[PDB]
Ligand SMILES: Nc1ncnc2c1ncn2[C@@H]1O[C@H](COP(=O)(O)OP(=O)(O)OP(=O)(O)O)[C@@H](O)[C@H]1O
Ligand SMILES: Nc1ncnc2c1ncn2[C@@H]1O[C@H](COP(=O)(O)OP(=O)(O)O)[C@@H](O)[C@H]1O
């Protein structure tokens with residue numbers, strides 16, 4: 035409602051980072067390179083955007 | 093959670109240059125005996141060794157000696173990953189430098205004594221930065237390989253030339269690596285360390301994930317908290333763990349009187365950081381350097397803020413440098429810094445809890461030698477509000493007290509101390525207790541108060557009141573899981589009202605010690621101020637300190653002073669008295685989550701207190717502290733005389749019968765009078781003992797009888813009716829009586 | 836001075852009128868004085884406590 039363009043950019047970044055967080059708990063975190071299948075499965079969804087909205091304040 | 097990951101294990105006979113792994117694990121790793129492999133360790137330290145097969149070694153463990161662990165800067169029980177080193181070839185040459193301290197006193201040539209037999213017909217792989225020990229000469233010498241040819245993986249063949257010429261390497265590098273600050277040296281900040289790790293380490297290691305999802309990692313991190321919580325510690329640990337240069341900026345350093353000097357300093361700092369990329373820019377006291385432009389009148393401050401905004405905007409140019417800041421009060425910072433592309437992510441570092449301060453104590457005491465008596469759990473428990481820096485200084489003071497004792501033993505004139513005295517040197521529990529006594533908590537360095545050491549047995553009677561007070565503080569903190577099962581939040585308010593001297597103030601002093609929770613005491617009118625908005629501002633500061641020091645007990649002694657019924661006075665001291673009550677109302681129950689802040693109020697006259705103060709949610713329980721009855725009067729006299737030696741002939745039970753309406757303080761005066769009479773008799777007796785030259789071990793019956801002649805009833809019968817009317821209004825307000833559900 | 840102190844370890848350092856050279860960094864007129872205080876702190880933190888050199892300030 036009161037979000038300036040910087041706030042919306044922060045929201046999009048937070049949603050993408052939340053998707054990356056979802057992919058965090060699966061990986062070993064010590065792998066030299068990440069698997070191609072989980073590389074392809076990574077995409078921003080509505081759940082990530084709603085989490086960002088819940089964590090979004092102007 | 094990979095086959096490469098293995099648990100650290102010791103070595104029975106395996107030496108430095110090789111490694112030994114269990115044969116099934118070697119087969120799982122597709123590794124043959126005699127193969128060269130790579131070891132990965134913490135702090136970005138690596139070594140190259142020959143893998144071996146051993147039946148003694150377990151499948152989940154890797155056999156390495158102490159020196160191999162010292163190479164990787166890792167301890168026993170750590171998790172490390174092993175990978176077969178690729179394309180390892182015989183070394184053309186190897187440049188080895190022994191430690192400078194070890195070479196001293198070695199008459200024979202270092203190379204011939206150590207290196208020539210060690211590498212003869214052995215083919216031992218080495219990487220740059222590897223240290224290996226060879227027994228020989230007068231003293232065992234550690235050799236550090238600064239240069240490897242070919243770098244970094246090479247095999248030392250007999251034909252490969254080995255030389256120890258040049259200035260021997262210093263132990264400073266080794267001790268700096270040992271003392272380098274990592275994530276493990278932070279205590280109580282694991283929840284915040286997770287977000288910091290996600291912000292910093294993840295983008296560096298897997299930028300492919302970010303490029304695939306098409307997002308860029310944040311560049312601004314704002315750590316805010318009380319001093320000593322380790323924000324600078326966390327920043328330096330992050331800088332060291334990621335192999336980035338740590339650059340420190342202090343707010344006073346940037347500040348300068350000359351025009352354009354502070355911004356030039358900031359630009360120079362950013363330029364040096366970008367040159368030393370990757371690097372971490374850390375700005376201590378960001379609040380002092382960058383306040384609100386509209387709020388500040390001085391031109392230089394908004395000048396610095398604008399320069400900082402420009403520097404942050406220009407920072408995001410793939411410079412691989414991340415700017416971090418530590419401040420006490422984030423709200424004092426210019427809001428333009430809080431936006432995205434700037435200090436967008438703010439991480440709250442708070443007062444460590446019991447387990448957090450236990451972790452801090454374990455971290456700082458890991459090098460100190462601890463006896464069996466000392467237990468760090470109780471040390472954490474008694475440190476109610478200490479911060480990490482306070483805990484470190486506390487451990488240092490306990491150690492220094494141990495040196496104080498061993499000094500009192502020793503003469504110090506001798507140049508060399510006997511080995512027996514050194515063997516006697518140790519650290520015990522009493523040293524830590526003394527450090528606890530001397531050290532003060534930074535959270536409450538303002539509200540520190542003396543402790544009369546009032547304990548429950550000091551209070552006589554009020555057993556029902558004592559039990560309720562403990563459950564108020566003990567239940568929510570010691571058993572929070574119980575409250576989540578039923579789902580209703582705990583009650584956090586009690587008002588004590590009654591005649592003066594019945595024990596309201598003792599219960600607050602006693603509750604401070606026993607429940608091991610932070611205790612803030614407000615003298616009744618202490619908060620009020622002559623300025624227009626300062627009386628209410630002091631109220632918000634008290635409730636903010638209590639929220640930061642949660643679990644905290646906020647004791648409002650003589651609550652009737654600041655909590656009056658609104659509208660009683662038109663002037664109300666200029667209307668400020670009502671505004672103080674309205675401020676108190678909002679903090680106790682307002683538009684915020686409730687922390688473990690337990691408000692306790694003691695008042696003589698409760699009927700004047702604002703009715704909004706006394707509703708459930710603010711001071712949930714109204715407890716009446718009456719005049720002690722006959723049974724309680726015995727307890728008060730027994731508790732008061734518990735310290736003093738009193739004759740067994742004294743019958744305390746009869747005193748309670750006679751003193752029908754005496755208060756707790758009145759009975760205390762009677763014992764005080766009896767003590768002075770017994771002291772006065774001793775003083776005159778010993779004077780007669782001196783006069784004849786030129787008795788009273790305990791208080792007898794006679795002193796009490798003379799004391800009772802001066803006994804008075806402090807609380808009048810008129811006042812007692814005033815207190816008993818109030819308790820009757822509560823009973824009549826409820827209605828009915830002996831409530832029971834039908835059948 | 837600190838280099839000579841570590842070179843001749845063990846050594847003893849005494850500073851006379853330290854407050855004259857090291858006022859409060861929050862309120863300091865000259866930048867040179869602030870840099871002197873910064874060098875004091877940097878040299879204090881630089882010693883790894885193996886120098887066994889005690890700095891005395893009056
Ligand atoms: N139940 C009690 N047991 C032991 N000592 C008591 C008791 N009640 C009162 N006293 C003694 O009375 C003195 C004052 O008591 P205290 O300060 O707790 O009273 P209070 O009811 O809070 O009074 P006030 O209304 O003046 O604030 C102390 O010496 C204390 O030891
Ligand atoms: N969470 C913590 N864990 C371990 N030690 C700590 C912690 N916080 C502070 N310390 C100790 O306090 C000392 C100084 O910390 P400091 O930089 O003053 O913290 P802050 O960033 O709050 O100013 C450090 O040497 C460290 O040993």
Ligand SMILES: [Mg+2]
Pocket residue numbers: 596597649650694
């Ligand atoms: Mg009192």
